Amino acid sequence: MRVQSKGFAIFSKDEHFKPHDFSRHAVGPRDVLIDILYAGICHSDIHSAYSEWKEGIYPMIPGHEIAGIIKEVGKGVKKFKIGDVVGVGCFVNSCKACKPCKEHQEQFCTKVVFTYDCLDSFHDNEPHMGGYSNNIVVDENYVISVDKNAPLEKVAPLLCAGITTYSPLKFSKVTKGTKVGVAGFGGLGSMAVKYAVAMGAEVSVFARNEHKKQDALSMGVKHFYTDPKQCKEELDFIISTIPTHYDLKDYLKLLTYNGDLALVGLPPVEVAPVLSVFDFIHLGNRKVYGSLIGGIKETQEMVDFSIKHNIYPEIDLILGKDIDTAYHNLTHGKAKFRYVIDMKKSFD
Amino acid sequence: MRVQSKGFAIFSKDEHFKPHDFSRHAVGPRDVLIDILYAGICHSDIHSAYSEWKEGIYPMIPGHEIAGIIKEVGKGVKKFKIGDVVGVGCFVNSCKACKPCKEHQEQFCTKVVFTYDCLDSFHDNEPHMGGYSNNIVVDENYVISVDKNAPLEKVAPLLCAGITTYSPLKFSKVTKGTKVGVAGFGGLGSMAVKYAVAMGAEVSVFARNEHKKQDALSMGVKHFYTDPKQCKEELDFIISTIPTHYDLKDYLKLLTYNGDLALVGLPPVEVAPVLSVFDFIHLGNRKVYGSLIGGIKETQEMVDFSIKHNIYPEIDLILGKDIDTAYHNLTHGKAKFRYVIDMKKSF
Ligand SMILES: NC(=O)C1=CN([C@@H]2O[C@H](COP(=O)(O)OP(=O)(O)OC[C@H]3O[C@@H](n4cnc5c(N)ncnc54)[C@H](OP(=O)(O)O)[C@@H]3O)[C@@H](O)[C@H]2O)C=CC1
Ligand SMILES: NC(=O)C1=CN([C@@H]2O[C@H](COP(=O)(O)OP(=O)(O)OC[C@H]3O[C@@H](n4cnc5c(N)ncnc54)[C@H](OP(=O)(O)O)[C@@H]3O)[C@@H](O)[C@H]2O)C=CC1
Ligand SMILES: [Zn+2]
Ligand SMILES: [Zn+2]
Ligand SMILES: [Zn+2]
Ligand SMILES: [Zn+2]
């Protein structure tokens, strides 16, 4: 039997979100049915909702920062029981037979099923629906285990903001004394800041004004800039989470010899920056790479780490009916860090 | 007293080379006068000659692969004597006072003087003339010491093709068992192969056809492709020397996790490939950087290493009057590896 669901859907790129009844695939012998308690809003939600990257699949239900409780399990499930506290991230399935799947980087699988705005090739190519909803059905190998005493409203954005920034920090070996820049001081940015500080880094933040400078300082940030040109120092590592137009050269030039610039931010495609061969050679010996989310394994490692060291996103709790207001704030320079939807209260 | 010279000049971006008489600044107290014996031809000479990157300064005398013999020294010269065999690469002066200068990366000095197609601010902003000529006057700190018995025609291209490929291989710590790809099998491509092979790497070459497949095999190349999509394994390190349009993503996607793509090739600016943020993220965990020539100190080390291990470019000797044919061959797929001008025989 298909699982009945409800959530907050957008029907085309210029409309408002509305309550939407729908259904998901039946609980298969390896699936679990999760009741969703908290749903983080990521800026990827907005880019997808508005078709800023590509043409979206509508009706769309975004949200891929999911924290909840296991209500039901398929009969072959071994990794979870009813009552378990869990999280779901940016994808819910992959082919499990390719090189990326075998290397625990399922996010690069060519048959990866992202949580929303993506056809589910494992269920007759039906559109997958995200986390702005009351439940979700996920193959057990894509579910993150969460400590039952962790604050669940704070856990939810670890599922995307947390892994996406944790991953390149570890990949570039950020450690004690590493000079780290964080460009874009929002949901991902503040997680990058917290992890780099917990890792022993000396952290610089680049924002567009000083509205959150005190929160930066309170996080242990050593330099706060409102323009990359103000930074007079060479950095070893920079993570750019910027979701609007900018010039990659302004950051690449800040790096020391053999420094890394890790790109996670994803502006709309028509304004997204590029680097040419001439740019790399002019600013030579400074390395650039991209990072996409993380694998299931490293996502589990990151959640475990974050709960252990009490490293959580700064969140503001809202209801499903506030989604349009949250998206406005996030696109007009009015947001703080993460918004999180209290899904139980939204569905009274 | 200005030094008198002659060589082979282009007078605008769409013309043929012509014999040209000209003069150079006098031998200053830290300068040496060098008699040019062999002048390597670099594709950078063509891009500059043809204004493919920016507005050229004409008349222009390219060549930044110079081997020769010191004929005079200024009175304050302390590293060189008359008779020393030496090389000159892509630049002839710098501020000496910035941080790149001090860290032996003079090629990044904002006041660097490139060997040609560049105004020399140390000499009243006059255009500097390169190596397609009988002589050159260079500050001694920009001159490379060359073993007096090394084969000078094969030394000349070390001064640019050598350092440019040697530097990123060292920077990326290519070593025994590293899987290395080299894209564009021409002057820099062949040097890069020979270094990587000498360093014990497993080497793949990427060309546009198989005309030089047997030569790759001769040099110890393990795999030869005519399309990057042919390559079915992951590479630790790729150096791209390509001077025409291509899609960077075809190479980036061949790198293993934590692999390096090193960019040195510089196609005309109007068709220079780019990577967007979307490209990097879709192809995550694979690092890209550019490399520019090398500093003097690393250039000296590269030359010492090459000479000591007998690692030399494959060269074909030509006359100065054959410059246009050589440029033709290099822009029409008919070149082998490096052309070198036999300067003593060119006048
Ligand atoms: N796997 C991946 O690679 C992932 C990528 N992302 C992408 O990361 C980007 C950021 O996500 P999220 O953290 O949720 O975004 P949010 O808006 O929280 O944060 C973006 C931040 O960047 C600041 N900002 C915007 N433009 C600039 C600029 N030009 N310079 C400096 N700061 C700027 C914004 O502040 P203000 O507007 O108030 O000035 C805001 O604080 C999005 O494009 C999202 O799609 C997200 C998850 C995963
Ligand atoms: N410091 C720096 O960064 C420096 C950069 N350079 C740049 O390096 C580039 C190459 O220099 P050089 O080695 O002298 O050039 P040459 O022409 O010797 O060699 C280039 C090679 O690339 C091959 N080739 C051309 N297009 C492609 C393609 N799309 N895919 C694969 N192979 C291709 C050519 O073969 P064919 O055309 O016959 O198919 C040729 O064999 C130039 O842009 C030059 O300016 C040079 C010195 C220093
Ligand atoms: Zn996200
Ligand atoms: Zn797969
Ligand atoms: Zn300088
Ligand atoms: Zn050159």
**B169 C-alpha to ligand 5 centroid (Å):** 25
Token couple for B121: 């601010």
Q: Which long-range contacts (CB under 8 A, 24 or more apart) does A20-28 make?
A: A20/A59, A20/A61, A22/A59, A22/A61, A22/A129, A22/A133, A24/A129, A24/A135, A24/A136, A24/A137, A25/A120, A25/A123, A25/A126, A25/A137, A26/A1, A26/A2, A26/A137, A27/A3, A27/A72, A27/A73, A27/A74, A27/A137, A28/A74, A28/A139
For A82-104, letters b (16+ CB in 10 Å) and e give: eebbbbbbbbbbbeeebebbeee
CATH architecture of B1-160+314-347: Alpha-Beta Complex (3.90)
- Taking the domains of chain B in order of start, what are their residue ranges? 1-160+314-347, 161-313
- At residue B240, the 3 state secondary structure works out as strand
Chain B residues with CB under 8 Å of A280 CB are 263, 288-290
Work out the widest C-alpha separation in chain B, in whole angstroms.
62
Token couple for B11: 């007078």
- Other beta carbons within 10 Å of A47: 21
Residue B101 — φ and ψ, nearest 5°? -55, -50
- C-alpha–C-alpha distance, residues A190 and A71, integer Å: 32
B110 at A interface, C-beta within 8 A: no
Residue-by-residue DSSP string for A280-308: HHHTTT-EEEE--S--HHHHHHHHHHHHH
Identify whether the C-beta of residue A188 lies closer than 8 Å to the C-beta of residue A171: no
- C-alpha–C-alpha distance, residues B319 and B159, integer Å: 20
Token couple for A324: 């349009």
- C-alpha–C-alpha distance, residues A143 and A146, integer Å: 10
- C-alpha–C-alpha distance, residues A50 and A117, integer Å: 11
Running DSSP on this structure, what letter comes out for residue A60?
Answer: B
A46, A131, A10: which is closest to A329 by C-alpha?
A46
Q: Please give the helix or strand (H or E) that residue B70 lies within, else none.
A: strand B66-73
The rounded radius of gyration (Å) of the Cα atoms in chain A is 20
Identify whether the C-beta of residue B64 lies closer than 8 Å to the C-beta of residue B128: no
Chain position carrying tokens 């259904």 = A23
Cβ B99 under 6 angstroms from ligand 2: no
- C-alpha–C-alpha distance, residues A261 and A283, integer Å: 12
Running DSSP on this structure, what letter comes out for residue B60?
Answer: B
CATH architecture of A1-160+314-348: Alpha-Beta Complex (3.90)
- C-alpha–C-alpha distance, residues B276 and B297, integer Å: 34
Kind of pairing, strands A126-127 and A119-120?
antiparallel
Identify whether the C-beta of residue A285 lies closer than 8 Å to the C-beta of residue A258: yes
List, in order, residues 6 or more apart from A104 with CB less than 8 Å away: A295, A296, A297, A298
Residue type, B317: L
B186, B216, B194, B206: which is closest to B338 by C-alpha?
B186
Chain A residues with CB under 8 Å of B284 CB are 108, 289-292
A188, A155, A204: which is closest to A302 by C-alpha?
A155
Identify whether the C-beta of residue B297 lies closer than 8 Å to the C-beta of residue A285: no
- At residue B168, the 3 state secondary structure works out as helix
**Could you tell me if residue B102 is left (phi over 0), alpha (psi between -120 and 50 degrees) or otherwise beta?**
alpha
**Could you tell me if residue B341 is left (phi over 0), alpha (psi between -120 and 50 degrees) or otherwise beta?**
beta
Q: Mutate which of A226, A242, A327 to test ligand 1's pocket (most atoms within 8 Å of Cβ)? A: A242
A274 at B interface, C-beta within 8 A: yes
HEC string for B244-297: CCCCHHHHHCCEEEEEEEEECCCCCHHHCCEEEHHHHHHCCCCEEEECCCCCHH
Q: Kindly give the number of the ligand 2 atom that is closest to the alpha carbon of B267.
A: 43
Cβ A48 under 6 angstroms from ligand 1: no
- At residue B230, the 3 state secondary structure works out as helix
Residue-by-residue DSSP string for B170-188: HHTT--TT-EEEEES-SHH
Angle ∠(B290,B291,B294) on CA atoms, nearest 5? 165
**A202 C-alpha to ligand 1 centroid (Å):** 21
Identify whether the C-beta of residue A20 lies closer than 8 Å to the C-beta of residue A60: no
- C-alpha–C-alpha distance, residues B224 and B212, integer Å: 10
- At residue A264, the 3 state secondary structure works out as coil
HEC string for A312-342: CCCEEEECHHHHHHHHHHHHCCCCCCEEEEE
- C-alpha–C-alpha distance, residues B52 and B55, integer Å: 8
Q: Which of A273, A286, A290 sits opposite B283 (nearest CB)?
A: A290
**A295 C-alpha to ligand 6 centroid (Å):** 43
Q: Which of A267, A274, A285 sits opposite B289 (nearest CB)?
A: A285
Preceding peptide of B59 cis, ω within 30°: yes
A6, A294, A41: which is closest to A129 by C-alpha?
A6
Identify whether the C-beta of residue A174 lies closer than 8 Å to the C-beta of residue A291: no
- C-alpha–C-alpha distance, residues B268 and B3, integer Å: 34
Preceding peptide of A59 cis, ω within 30°: yes
- At residue B67, the 3 state secondary structure works out as strand
Chain position carrying tokens 């050159």 = B136
Q: Which of A257, A258, A263 sits opposite B280 (nearest CB)?
A: A263
Residue-by-residue DSSP string for B2-24: PEEEEEEEB-STTSPPEEEEEEE
- Other beta carbons within 10 Å of A177: 9
Identify whether the C-beta of residue B183 lies closer than 8 Å to the C-beta of residue B203: no
List, in order, residues 6 or more apart from A232 with CB less than 8 Å away: none
Task: Tell if the CB–CB gap between B281 and A292 is shorter than 8 Å.
Answer: yes
Chain position carrying tokens 């769309």 = A60
Residue-by-residue DSSP string for A81-128: -TT-EEEE-SEEE--SSSHHHHTT-GGG-TT-EESSSSEETTTTTEEP
A285 at B interface, C-beta within 8 A: yes
Percent of residues in chain B assigned helix, strand, coil, to nearest 5? 30, 30, 40
- Other beta carbons within 10 Å of A309: 11
Identify whether the C-beta of residue A279 lies closer than 8 Å to the C-beta of residue B290: yes
B266 at A interface, C-beta within 8 A: yes
Distance (Å) of CA B94 to CA A37, B48, B106, B119? 64, 20, 6, 12
Domain B161-313: which CATH number of 3.30.470.20, 3.40.50.300, 3.40.50.720, 3.90.180.10? 3.40.50.720
Q: Kindly give the number of the ligand 2 atom that is closest to the alpha carbon of B189.
A: 13
Task: Tell if the CB–CB gap between B277 and A266 is shorter than 8 Å.
Answer: yes
Chain position carrying tokens 């044919």 = B325
